Structures are given as C-alpha cells and as structure tokens.
Nucleic acid binder design. Structure first.
Lengths: 179, 178, 179, 178
DNA sequence: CAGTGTCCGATAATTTAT
DNA sequence: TTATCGGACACTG
DNA sequence: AGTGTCCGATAATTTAT
DNA sequence: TTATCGGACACT
DNA sequence: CAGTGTCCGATAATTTAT
DNA sequence: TTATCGGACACTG
DNA sequence: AGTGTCCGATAATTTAT
DNA sequence: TTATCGGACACT
C-alpha cells in the first residue's frame, strides 16, 4: 500500500517535470519519488532496495520503467517476489495480479517490436544518406592547413600544441590522413 | 552449423521423443544437448559453444525456458551473439523482430495458464490435507521393533548394526512416541 | 448487472453439466441460463436478444463463447454496443473495460493458433495413415456378393430392394464399383 | 498475380505516399485500389476480383481495417478464398497461422491505444466547450441585413433572390433572435 | 402411359487426433 | 472422411 | 403560386496525440 | 461539433 | 637520462529519425 | 557516428 | 570411543490438469 | 510434501 513513485528521462527534452506532475496527483509525494536522468540507472537500484513487503509503486507509462523488454520483466519478477506492485498510470495495468503482469510483459514486447523496426528504418535511411553524399558526425574546427605548414617546416610536433593551443595527440593524427 | 536442444522434468522421460524430431530435422547427436532437470548445466555449455551464423532447435517452446523471464534473457543474449532458435512445434524463429516478440507473447500467456493451474493444484492439496490424507513417502522400517530394542536397554549404535539401517534414524524414532 | 449465463458443448462428452454447475455458484440461475448443444447456435441468438442496457453475462471459459476468433469479437463488439458484459470465469477477464475485451480478443487468437496448428498435425497424421494402409470411413455392412449374383441373374434392380430390404439407390452404385 | 491497396482519412491526403511504396514493391496502378473515406466501395471491388494464388499489399496495418473486428473478418474471408495480405511496414503475411494471429494481436492492442487516445480527445473537447469555446464553422452571411429585410416587411422569398443565398436559411435566421 | 438408370443432398456411422 | 437412405428428374421404352 | 416548417446532404469547422 | 445548402412536405 | 611517434578510452559535439 | 581531449607506454635517440 | 542432537542430500511419495 | 539416508558437530 505505502505508495512509491518512479520516473525517468533520456532525450534533450527533459520531459521530467510532466512525469512527476501526475505521480503526485495520483497520491504519492516527492518524499518518495525516484529519478534517473539517463546520461547508470542508479535512482532505480535505490528504489529497488527501499521497498519492502506490501509496498506499491507508480510509473507514468510502460516505457518509463524499462526500455528493454527482457529486464522490464526481471524487475517485475523480482518485484512480485518482494510483494511490490508497480502501476502503469497511462496504461492502467497492475503488476499485482497475474493477468496484470502477464499483460504488462505482453504490451512491452509488442511495443519494442515497434522500436526494433523503427531503428532498422532509421538506419536504412542513414545508409541511403551516407551513400547519397551527406557530411557525417562532427565538422573540422581547427585549420589543418595551419598545421600542415607547421610540419613541412620540420618543426617539433610538441611545440605546435602551444603555438596553436590545442591537443598534442591530434597534431599527429592530422598529418596521417593525407597519404 | 546447426544445433539441437532438449529437456525433461517428469519421471515420464519424454526425452527420447524430443531428440527423435531433432534428427528428423537435420541435427546429429554430435550437436545435440540435454538437461535432465533434477540445474541447467548442459544449456550453459551449448550457450558457450556457438558463434555467429548458427541456429538452435527445440521441439516445444516451454522446453527452452519454463519461466517467461529468463527465456527472453537467453534469446536476447542469443541474438546478440548471432544465433537463433527455431521451435519446430510452433514454427517460430528468433532470427527476426516479430519472431522474437512472438516467442515472448506466446510464452507469457503460456504461463498465466501454467501459473493458474499450479494454484489449482495447490487448492487440491489444500482440500486433501484437510480432509485427512497422508502425504510423503510411507514408513517402512519396523519401528515397534526398534522401540522394543531400546525398551530392552540396548545400545542405540548396536541397533543400527543389527538392523541394516541408519543410526540417526534410530534416535529420531524414539523421540517419536512421547 | 442483472446477470445472465451461457454455456455450450460439442463432443460426445456432454460436459455440459459441469459448465452450468458453476454458472449458478457464480450467482446466476437457470431461469436465465442459455444452451446450444452443437449438433445452429440458436440458444445464443435468443440470449443475444433477451439482453438489454446494463446487463451482465457469464461464460465458463474463453472457448465457450465462440470457437472462431473472428466472430468471438463480433459478439463482444455488438455486446459492448448494447452495454452488456460477459466474463470468462476461468480466465477472469471483463468484456466491460477496454483492456478487458482487448485482452479477451488477445487470448483468443493466441489460442486458435494452437488449434490451427493442431488440425494441421492431425491431418498430417491422417495422410501418413491413409498412405500407410489403414481402412477409412465406414465399413461395408451388406454383402455385395449377394447383390452381384442377383444382377448377373439379369434380375430387375427394383425387385432386389425388397428381396434384400435395403435402399434401391445403393443397389445400382454397388454394381458400378467393379469395372 | 499480385495486388496493392491503400486508404486515407485526413485532409492530409498521405495517399500519394502509400501508393509510391506499392510500386516500389512490384504492383502497378493496373492492380492498385483506393478508398478515400468520406463508404469502403473500392475495397469490395478488390475483394470481388481475386482468386486462389493471389497476394494483396497495404503499407500500414491499420490501413486495411481501422476496427480490429472486421479486420479479421476480411482476412478470414481472404484466407478461405486463397489470398493473403502482406503488410510492408510491419512485414507480416496472413499466408500463415502465426501471421494471421500476429496480424490480429498487433491490431487489438493498436486499438486500445487508438481508443484511449480518442477518449482523451473528447476530454479535451469537454474541457474546452465548458471554458467557453465556439465550435463548428463560423457564421458568414450578414444577418443584421437579412433581419433588416424582414423588419422592412419584405417577402422572405424576395430576400433569397436579392442576396445570392438560400431561402430556408432566411427563415431560420429570423427565429434566431427572439 | 411405369420401370430402369443418374444423380444429388441430407442423415447415420466411422476414423484421427486432443 | 465414406455408406446408405430417402428422394428427384429424365429418358427410355 | 407562394409563404412558412422541418428534415438530411455538404461545408466548414474545432480537438487530439 | 454548428451553418448552410439543397430540398421536400404541409398549409393559406 | 626527455623528445618523438603509436595508440587507446573516456568526453563533447554532431547526425538521422520519431 | 566522427573530433578532440586527456592521458599511457615504448622506443628511440 | 561412543552416546545423543541436529542439519542437509536422496528417496519415495502425493496432487494436478 | 514427509522418511530415510548419509553425515557433521557438541558433550560425557
């Protein structure tokens, strides 16, 4: 019964404020609301150990507990073992029954099958972009023309890293590209 | 490279049967593995001797993992390595997205049944132990004789040599009829 | 609320007595318990029309409503339209929620996928039995040796159907087999 | 023989897009059909012009049938005839057992979402109509002029010819300001 | 004109699987 | 599935 | 004829992730 | 959803 | 003995998709 | 994904 | 040594569709 | 499940 609360975020959109907002309006106070800001899921492990027999948790929706269906279960399993139940406020399913957890784990694998496809289409769309002729990753920031002139000079490589206040390791690798 | 896996639980060793189908699929006992759950060692070994481009087989689904949870755990560890299990009875391959999903759902449901029926078994145990049924293995050793061999004033150790039976039992037997 | 009850049977094992047995112990009386003995699902159609807004039904398990997932839904859909809910006493799911019916229809298709496979293995096992050399269908009951002697006679075919008190149509077809 | 099917709902006619993929699969507009839901006639026609050994295509799953129920009804009628739909986005074929099943589950769940979100839309309509928002199409015709053309004592029919507008509306307009 | 042969569909009796 | 049972026509004679 | 009511088809609207 | 359009009716 | 070149892993900056 | 940033060795001289 | 307790591994048990 | 087996301990 003695309700807990758990939420998370992972994107540049820290939609965390929203997550919490209802966890309160449900019944549970911050005094018992846990959070990982997926930069390592620490605040979860800690929640995992604060709970005891006949506790109850609350997670906004189905994705918010675990990303990977495989261990989304492990939690629930380990959780039901202790006697703790987590509800999916958006989905409205109880870890606590059978049918509940059963249909939790049901919905997850059916929802990852969406992500798993998404990522293939995301990557297929990056392989038709890389090959098309698009610039990748991060751009050159420091003039390599300034470095190559300072090496054809026959100048000591270590000296350059403070004439141009940059990393010494990059100096070398830069010269290695143009074969 | 292709592989076969099988398992058992009951005293009814349907093991010979599972293996048969495996050979009727193309895997030899040269690449077949078995665990007689009594402790899943033989599985670990198979899980340690397959690389990318390999395919495992099990007759029934439940056969790989009874519990839905660690079932995916394997399959996950498995798809990551490059291996995939086909199930002959249900005809699903972890070699895909849906496949993997459809292994999982199947098995979740599969358990809600397994788990509810389990409860029904325990209800049946409850409605039996209360009505007056004797559980466990029934007694064998002629106790009224052992008890007559203490009443004698004989060594308890002496008993356990005279009767080809265990000594620690002898003592327990006496502290049975208070 | 005003509870109803529905059960069915289809095999030589008329396990109907059992079906009813609990439909009562649930709360509903025979006064409102319906039955088709699948010899045509009439007693269902009638139940379908006796129910009104805010009624509630009860069916032993998931198979017992409908066999074919396709219309198992139609019922539920048509049923939820009226405001009537059917429960799956063995399964413990409510037509009444969403998640309920959703997970009813979930379980059915996953359970037919069992039957659909079964029948293929049943038939595969009949095709390896027919070819193996097993007698099929129904056995000859009336001596065809007695009929063939009564036709080589040049005897009128109609006459034979009352000398041997049998069907007149079979008389003919019998002679047609031995080419 | 292979076939293509597509559909639309929104004023955002993503129709041109669905068809594109169909051609990128191998079906010509010579064997492609479309319903612009405004009434699923074009489907019926396709359902009436395929025999055994044919295969239909739709981009998304929801596209065939929105409602989970009649979705299977089609697929059932379909497997019986000898035809089967592949869905390119999800990559599932009704040409199988699991396939058919896995079409269905997918679509059931798919709806629990569709249906719950629908409710959320209606909650948003409720929290808007109560706060004080004007729904429907906004008024156009200069009523204070029509009302000034009865106050005149002019024929109502006369109005509807003078202003290039409908007559029945004229009357309704007057019984608006009691 | 009425008996002989062709051809169904609806019923009863059987099999393989659980 | 396969066997009979009622029948329905349609020609034959 | 022509003045008044009372429908359903078509247009333009809003709300929602 | 509400506003207009086409109408089709029933009465002076 | 100390400067020159090889080679990581851990961090920050970027892209494609929703 | 790709760029730098700190570093760690290991030889060279 | 040898007499008494108090564990866990192995055997034989039952209940269930 | 309860009954025996192997034991390993702590005390006269």
């Amino acid at each position: 019964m003695a309700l807990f609360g758990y939420a998370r975020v992972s994107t540049s959109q820290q939609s965390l404020d929203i997550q919490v907002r209802a966890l309160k309006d449900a019944g549970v106070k911050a005094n018992r609301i846990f959070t990982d800001k997926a930069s390592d899921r620490k605040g979860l492990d800690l929640l995992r150990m604060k709970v005891k027999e006949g506790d109850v948790i609350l997670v906004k929706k189905l994705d918010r507990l675990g990303r990977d269906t495989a261990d989304m279960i492990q939690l629930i399993k380990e959780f039901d073992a202790q006697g703790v139940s987590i509800r999916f406020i958006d989905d409205s399913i109880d870890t606590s029954s059978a049918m509940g957890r059963m249909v939790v784990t049901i919905l997850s694998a059916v929802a990852q099958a969406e992500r798993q496809r998404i990522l293939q289409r995301t990557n297929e769309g990056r392989q038709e972009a890389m090959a098309k002729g698009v610039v990748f990753g991060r751009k050159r920031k420091i003039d390599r023309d300034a470095v190559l002139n300072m090496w054809q000079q026959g100048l000591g490589a270590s000296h350059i890293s403070k004439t141009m206040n940059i990393a010494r390791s990059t100096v070398y690798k830069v010269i290695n590209e143009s074969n």
